[PDB]
Amino acid sequence: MIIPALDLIGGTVVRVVRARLRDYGNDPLPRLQDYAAQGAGVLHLVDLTGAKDPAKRQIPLIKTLVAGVNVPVQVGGGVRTEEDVAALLKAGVARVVLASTAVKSPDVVKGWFERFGAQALVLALDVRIDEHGTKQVAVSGWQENSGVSLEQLVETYLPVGLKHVLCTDISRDGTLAGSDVSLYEEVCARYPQIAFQSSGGIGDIDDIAALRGTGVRGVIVGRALLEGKFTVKEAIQCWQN
């Protein structure tokens, strides 16, 4: 499926561009609602306010947004503790997106899988392809690699039933550059029991077409939709054909 995505900061719709941020206004709910109206089955939100300060997690806004659409929303941003996870689920989010903590504290996160179930969690892994061609996990675009490959980390979580992995190619994140097809083709084939989501690099409908035969289950689209390159409807039509 197509997974429309919005980045929120103090209720302001934004997205990382390449790394800067641009303001797409302050009415996230009508946006999401129109995404859903066009047939989206899943939505993605990053709470950048919550990411910077867990105590400032935009729980009331998140509640509103979730309540305001009829589809599961996966929500990330500053998910550092078991309490963060529970708070977001309690607010009504369908899945909690675990990013840096998934790399940082795998044993702790495996316990979260045990408590919340694999359907409640998405592991968001940023990947750099190094000089050797290894898919290196990094916790962000501005930090060095963390010393673990995508495969090794995925393998870490398979024993607790890992089902959802969001994989961002760091080089293409928010660049409109076209996503990295080979990366997704390899991982998806290796772990067919996992539903991979691709993120970054979607600039036009052709980028979505490029992902079709790869095994990638979901395609995060943020920037392209905000900039009017194509619609959710067109993205879905392309994705499904």
Side-chain angles (χ1 to χ4, degrees), residues 1-17 19 21 23-241:
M1 81 285 292
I2 298 296
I3 308 174
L6 290 191
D7 274 24
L8 308 162
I9 309 188
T12 302
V13 181
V14 309
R15 269 251 107 167
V16 185
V17 297
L21 292 175
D23 180 346
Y24 306 98
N26 296 278
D27 226 349
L29 178 53
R31 273 189 200 278
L32 295 182
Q33 287 177 328
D34 198 52
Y35 288 169
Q38 295 177 70
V42 186
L43 300 170
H44 180 88
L45 293 184
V46 178
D47 172 8
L48 294 183
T49 299
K52 190 20 174 195
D53 193 352
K56 302 199 182 200
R57 186 176 319 288
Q58 306 175 73
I59 285 284
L61 173 59
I62 289 159
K63 263 179 65 66
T64 294
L65 296 179
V66 160
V69 297
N70 81 322
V71 298
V73 187
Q74 44 182 52
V75 177
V79 179
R80 312 315 200 73
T81 77
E82 195 185 329
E83 292 68 45
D84 296 332
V85 181
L88 285 170
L89 297 172
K90 201 192 211 316
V93 322
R95 309 203 279 256
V96 175
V97 180
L98 322 166
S100 68
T101 306
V103 181
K104 179 181 83 176
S105 301
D107 198 75
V108 166
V109 177
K110 283 161 71 186
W112 297 355
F113 274 87
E114 287 161 355
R115 174 178 173 186
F116 300 110
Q119 283 312 313
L121 308 173
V122 174
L123 302 193
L125 310 180
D126 296 348
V127 165
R128 286 195 191 98
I129 303 283
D130 65 18
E131 25 186 293
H132 305 288
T134 301
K135 314 168 185 65
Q136 301 288 359
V137 175
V139 302
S140 72
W142 50 277
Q143 287 168 102
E144 288 198 293
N145 299 340
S146 287
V148 60
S149 73
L150 181 53
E151 288 96 343
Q152 289 151 9
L153 203 52
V154 164
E155 271 152 48
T156 299
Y157 288 103
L158 277 175
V160 297
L162 178 59
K163 287 302 171 192
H164 303 282
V165 176
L166 188 170
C167 177
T168 310
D169 192 330
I170 291 187
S171 60
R172 293 163 192 306
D173 198 344
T175 59
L176 275 30
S179 41
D180 178 18
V181 169
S182 51
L183 155 65
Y184 295 111
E185 265 165 338
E186 312 162 3
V187 306
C188 289
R190 183 168 174 84
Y191 310 102
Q193 68 274 53
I194 293 168
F196 289 91
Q197 313 173 3
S198 54
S199 171
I202 301 303
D204 58 46
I205 224 57
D206 285 344
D207 294 330
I208 291 182
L211 284 179
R212 264 186 284 148
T214 66
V216 166
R217 189 63 42 74
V219 184
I220 306 277
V221 187
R223 177 132 98 89
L225 297 171
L226 293 167
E227 299 178 340
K229 303 309 198 54
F230 54 80
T231 64
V232 168
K233 184 64 189 175
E234 289 176 325
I236 294 174
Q237 283 174 331
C238 173
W239 177 242
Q240 294 179 346
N241 291 252

